[PDB]
Every structure is written in C-alpha cells, then in structure tokens.
Design a protein around this ligand. Sequence first.
Ligand SMILES: COc1nc2ccc(Br)cc2cc1[C@@H](c1ccccc1)[C@@](O)(CCN(C)C)c1cccc2ccccc12
Lengths: 81, 51
Amino acid sequence: MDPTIAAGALIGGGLIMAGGAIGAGIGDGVAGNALISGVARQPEAQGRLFTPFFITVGLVEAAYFINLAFMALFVFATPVK
Amino acid sequence: MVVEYVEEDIGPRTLYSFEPDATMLFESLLPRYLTTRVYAALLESAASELA
Ligand SMILES: COc1nc2ccc(Br)cc2cc1[C@@H](c1ccccc1)[C@@](O)(CCN(C)C)c1cccc2ccccc12
C-alpha cells in the first residue's frame, strides 16, 4: 500500500522538479540573452530593458515556483494516502 | 580612394545597425560618393568660370 505509493510520489516529485528546472533555466537563459545583447548594443539602455526582462523572468520563475509547490505536495503531503 | 584613419574620436558609443550588412551598403555608396564628388567639382568649376 504505502511503499509503492511513496515511491511513485518520489518519482513524480523528481519529474516535477526536473521539468521546472529545465524550463526555468532555459527561459532565463533566453531572456538574459536578449538583455545582454540589448545592453551590448546600447549600454545606456540597461535601465529601460529591465522592465520587459523582469516581466519575462516573472512569468518564467512563476512556473518554477508552481512546480516547486506541487513537488512538496507530492513528497510531504502525498495526495493519495 | 585612400583609407585614412582619423581616431576613435568618441569613446564607447551605441552600435549602428546595418541592413543587410555594412559591406553591401559600403559598396553601394562608393560609386554614389564618386558621383557626388564629380558633381561638386562641376559646380565649383561653373562658379569659377563665371567669376
Ligand atoms: C498569466 O497568468 C495566467 N494566464 C492565463 C491565461 C490563460 C488561461 Br486559460 C489561464 C491563465 C492562467 C494564468 C495564471 C492563473 C492566475 C490566476 C488563477 C489561475 C491561474 C497561472 O496559470 C499562470 C502560470 N504561469 C505563469 C506559469 C497561475 C497558475 C497557478 C498559480 C499561479 C500563481 C501565480 C501566478 C499565476 C499562476
């Protein structure tokens, strides 16, 4: 009963965190690529390029955080017990 | 023409975008510059002839 459910919960939490980290890492990488390029072309534009950047990042990290939450729900408060 | 280097003049500045790239526009502008100089020479010679 409990052992295989806990094993499935651990594997599911691992999948959730893996997907979240892949998505967050690559999304941050692409957005920061855009930011570094825009600052390398126009240094004085660093101040005005942080408002779209932090919008994008704000969405990206959101996904990460949500996945984090569910990871906890899978490993600390297993929804099927 | 002779390539003459003046100086960096302004220090770090904004990067200029070129469509499609710098070499195409340069080779499109070179004969236009020749023609502009020929035209300026013609105008100067006309004013000189009148004087
Ligand atoms: C941009 O936000 C959206 N746009 C949508 C567009 C279309 C549709 Br049909 C659904 C949309 C839903 C949303 C959010 C939302 C807001 C309120 C309630 C439910 C869903 C979201 O799903 C975004 C998740 N992203 C950003 C990873 C979300 C879910 C869960 C927790 C969140 C916590 C914080 C912020 C957003 C949270």
